[PDB]
Symmetry: C5
């Protein structure tokens, strides 16, 4: 009936995945000769705690990571008109973006699952709680306090992975209104850094947040 169509779609999905993760090897990761661009964007849910005894602030946020792999492309016509699929992030290569000034291991607040689609684009959007080095002086004033945290590849330079922000403005829309702290401003900026060691540029995305007690 109509639900035989349900079967073919299940069968078609299995088949696509098989073609992708079994018939073909897992991605070795970007190389100088296969540079990759990773798009990074932040949405800030809560500032849970600002600790002036340890100088550590706790953020809860979503981090949108996306990038494209030719290895992940397919023609939806051969696979029953499937233009995408959800999958565990264990089954696909994921980038090593990390907070550079984490003071604690990051806690993952969301299922770790990615969306892949026919163009070979991947959307990974992990929700997480980060503790990072922040001195909150003046959080209780009106001018407020400001803390920065940088994100980027741990093991890869600009010639292998390239960071870009699609928007310079941090997304404040889902932030918690009844949170102890209120956001004056938050901005995600991209930078490039150099070392005498090597001529390769090293990108980071610097997250700057201004906030006060509420």
């Amino acid at each position: 009936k109509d639900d035989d169509d349900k079967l073919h779609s299940q069968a078609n999905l299995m088949r696509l995945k098989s073609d992708l993760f079994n018939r073909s090897p897992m991605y070795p990761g970007p190389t100088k000769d296969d540079p990759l661009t990773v798009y990074l964007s932040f949405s800030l849910l809560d500032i849970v705690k600002a600790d002036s005894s340890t100088n550590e602030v706790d953020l809860v946020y979503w981090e949108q990571q996306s990038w494209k792999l030719n290895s992940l492309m397919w023609d939806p016509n051969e696979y029953g008109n499937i233009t995408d699929f959800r999958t565990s992030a264990a089954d696909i290569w994921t980038p090593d973006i990390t907070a550079y000034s984490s003071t604690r291991p990051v806690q993952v607040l969301s299922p770790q699952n990615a969306l892949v689609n026919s163009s070979g684009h991947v959307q990974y959007l992990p929700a997480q709680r980060l503790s990072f080095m922040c001195d909150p002086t003046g959080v209780d004033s009106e001018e407020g306090a400001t803390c920065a945290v940088k994100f980027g590849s741990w093991s890869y330079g600009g010639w292998e992975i390239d960071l870009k922000t699609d928007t310079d403005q941090v997304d404040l829309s889902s932030y918690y209104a009844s949170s102890k702290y209120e956001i004056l401003s938050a901005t995600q900026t991209r930078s490039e850094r150099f070392y005498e060691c090597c001529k390769e540029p090293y990108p980071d995305v610097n997250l700057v947040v201004k906030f006060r007690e509420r």
Copy 2:
């Protein structure tokens, strides 16, 4: 013989799980062409802590999840008139339902097991302790504090996974009599979210709790 029956019974179950799990590849997940409906529900047990300095609350509750897969269906006459069986939750596909509001990784307080039966209905009922953003303010008065947390699939829209609920009434019959906090109202409310960007519905269940200090 009584023993011979116990024997056949077992073998039957092994064969049955074998047919589903070994012989067919585990279910790939829902698609638009093959949507899934998940029924949620909540049973309240304890509000353990309300933290005024961080604005977080600790809740201990049962979250009931149900769904149906044709893949899990079988004929009881085929396998010993077995109408249902228990299984480890890692043996079956489970839905990526998550509280969108959590401040700490959820902790599981019970075995992870699911009931499954002949028509392919899965029943999963994890006990959990959750910390989420809430404002305790006013919990020391008569009106109490009201807090809320949204649950829904993290990776899936309403055209793949659709959220539903038995009732709008949270189950308090199991709530801890001696808890530091007493519960005034508790509700589970469904809604669908729509974005500028996309035509697809994004459902959630909204758990709303009204609570105050016990004395």
Copy 3:
């Protein structure tokens, strides 16, 4: 005697291979193959009673024991081995939970079971459980009282039956210098029934009367 030692080990490996490799792991109890599990508690310490969260922390040993026909053997075929120790991971274990725990149960002991030729299993693991309790009275003479129910999570009385050896919780191992004194501890079986759905459910109720020491 060396050879005798080598033959004892060969025998044990062979007995083990027959159960966990020759035949596939027990699917668990059912209506037509029900199981009885005996529970007995031994109370070690009450480490903390928190008045602010209404939580109590306990250290205790939980004796679980049961019979499985698939675990039987005739010692003569196997070098007169009448019992062995095994990793609890290797055998089906009943799913018994504290119903009113407020944290994940912490395991203090190696998880290892005793099996013998009649097919009886004995598993005792030391745990720290924190659960829902009202401490008030703990600073009085009469003392505070708390209770926790233990039973199966996903099985009913028709599949798993609960039973106790005695109604007397064992205090013989209870820490003398503990912050809290144990006035009484009882362990009582009860069956939960419904008008609605016809299958009994069991549980064992650990009730503890305790006060601050003087």
Copy 4:
């Protein structure tokens, strides 16, 4: 060259590790017909905290375990004259020795790796942080306070696993000079019990620590 010496070096070890682990099953454990002697010795590094509110003390120490297995023996002449090698603690069998009074799961501060040598002796030294039941009362005085914690096999009796101890003196040579607590005495004593149940003796090693606030 001096390279060839290194290649045989590696190959003989890979070879030796394979003959023990791959071509032979893992040791089933001690039995009444095949008993094993375990040596337990302690070295104290720190007493981190005494908590007078819960009556628990937190201790950092090395626990040295030694035993000899016939199935770990080899002739050095036959592999490269290799008399010993380091392996992951998970590759071999380990005795299950536990603090009987621990109030939290133990935390390992060190890699888990053992040393094995040609006569079948194994030496395993995990650095651990343990919390055990102790009443700190008197730790602010001159006599200090005294606690004890028994270690032993959880699942095996004296006819299967035989506990012995190196010294009655717990090694203080590595203890931390600047600790909030000074150690007056630390001793490790072997002991055995009997039960109404059985004739088989149960050994434990009793670690008794006397300490007081340094100042």
Copy 5:
């Protein structure tokens, strides 16, 4: 075309990793007959907390580790002129190197991935947070406190793994300027210790740190 080079790139590196890892057995570890030198280097980041009740301190740093294995070499010519690659550190051998005075299990703040190059050199650099035994006394003083922590192999002696440092100067350039505590000095120094038990040396690197409550 342009994308052809891309493929050969991907294929080449999958082939290289296959020859080293799936074709050859993971390295058995150093031996007295095949010893190894690991270099340690420290870059100090934050002293997060100093606990004067328990005398433990919490520290954040990067620890650079490098060694060389002949078994990890290749000719870049046979292999598309790949001169190095990134990999998970679970796929290679890593030295067991522990802070000896740790009071709580080390936490890792970064991805455990390591870089390997055609000469055979391996370079591994985790961020960690360490609780270790230190008495913060006179951290109030303008003169500060002083603490040290030892690092070495847990299971290996000096004839199997020899421990070295590139500079006796700890790298402070990445230190957090707004930290509760300021760094007066940090040194990293190689020690060697003999026991009666054996005539074999046991190396360690000592990290010595003098800090005080920051006043800016």
